[PDB]
From a paper:
Recently, the YEATS (YAF9, ENL, AF9, TAF14, SAS5) domains were identified as “readers” of lysine acylation, including acetylation and crotonylation. Unlike the bromodomains with end-closed binding cavities, the YEATS domain adopts an end-open aromatic “sandwich” cage to recognize histone lysine acylation. The AF9 YEATS domain adopted an immunoglobin fold that consisted of a two-layer β sandwich between eight antiparallel β strands. The AF9/ENL YEATS domains recognize acylated histones to recruit the super elongation complex and, in turn, DOT1L on active chromatin.
Herein, we identified four small-molecule hits against the AF9 YEATS domain using NMR fragment-based screening. The crystal structure of the AF9 YEATS domain in complex with hit 2 was hence solved to depict their interaction mode. The highly conserved residues F28, H56, S58, F59, Y78, and F81 together formed a serine-lined aromatic cage for acyl-lysine recognition, where hit 2 was embedded with a clearly visible electron density. The benzyl moiety of hit 2 interacted with H56 through π-π stacking. The amide nitrogen and ether oxygen of hit 2 participated in the formation of hydrogen bonds with the side-chain hydroxyl of S58, while the carbonyl group of hit 2 formed a hydrogen bond with the backbone amide of Y78. Furthermore, this carbonyl group also participated in the water-mediated hydrogen bonds with W32 and A79. The structure of AF9 YEATS in complex with hit 2 indicated the feasibility to improve ligand potency. Furthermore, superimposition of the crystal structures of AF9 YEATS in complex with hit 2 or H3K9cr peptide suggested that the chlorine group of hit 2 may be substituted. As the crystal structure also revealed that the methoxyl group of hit 2 pointed toward the unoccupied groove surrounded by residues F28, P60, and E75, we substituted the methyl group with a benzyl or phenyl group (compounds 10 and 11). The binding affinity of hit 2 was then determined by best fitting the dose-dependent CSPs of these residues at 0.07 ± 0.01 mM (fitting error was used henceforth unless specifically annotated).
Numbering used by the authors: 5 to 138
Write the structure that this text describes.
Amino acid sequence: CAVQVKLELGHRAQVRKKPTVEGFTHDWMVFVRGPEHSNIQHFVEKVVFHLHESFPRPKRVCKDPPYKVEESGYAGFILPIEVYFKNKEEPRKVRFDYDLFLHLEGHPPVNHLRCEKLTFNNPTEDFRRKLLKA
Ligand SMILES: COCC(=O)Nc1ccc(Cl)c(N)c1
C-alpha cells in the first residue's frame, strides 16, 4: 500500500539596509516544510542544512520544526538538504540540492518555493502511519 507525501523547499533573500561588519550584503532564510496545514514532523526525524564551507559550522541541524536556517551572506551557493525520516528502513533519508540564490540590489526580495514529491511504495506499517498523519 503505497503512500505519497510532499515537501516544500524554499528561501527568502533580502538586501540589507546596511552590510554587516563582515561586509555581508544579504539576509536569507532557507526552509523545508510541508504544504500548508500539514505537519511533516510526524515523519521527519531531522533536516540537515549543509551551508557553504565559508560559514562557521556549515552543517546546520534542525531536529524540531521549524526546519529552517536564518543567515547572512554575500553570495549564493548550492545548499544540499538532507531530510531524515522517523523510521529504521530504506530510505532512511532523502537529499536535495537547493539553489540558494540572491538577487541584486534594486530587485524585489527573493521569495522562492519548490515542491518535491516523496513516493514510498512499500513502507513499514509504522512508517506508513507516520506518513499518513501529515
Ligand atoms: C561567510 O559566509 C558568507 C558567505 O556568503 N559565503 C559564501 C557563500 C557562497 C559562496 Cl559561492 C562563497 N564563495 C562564499
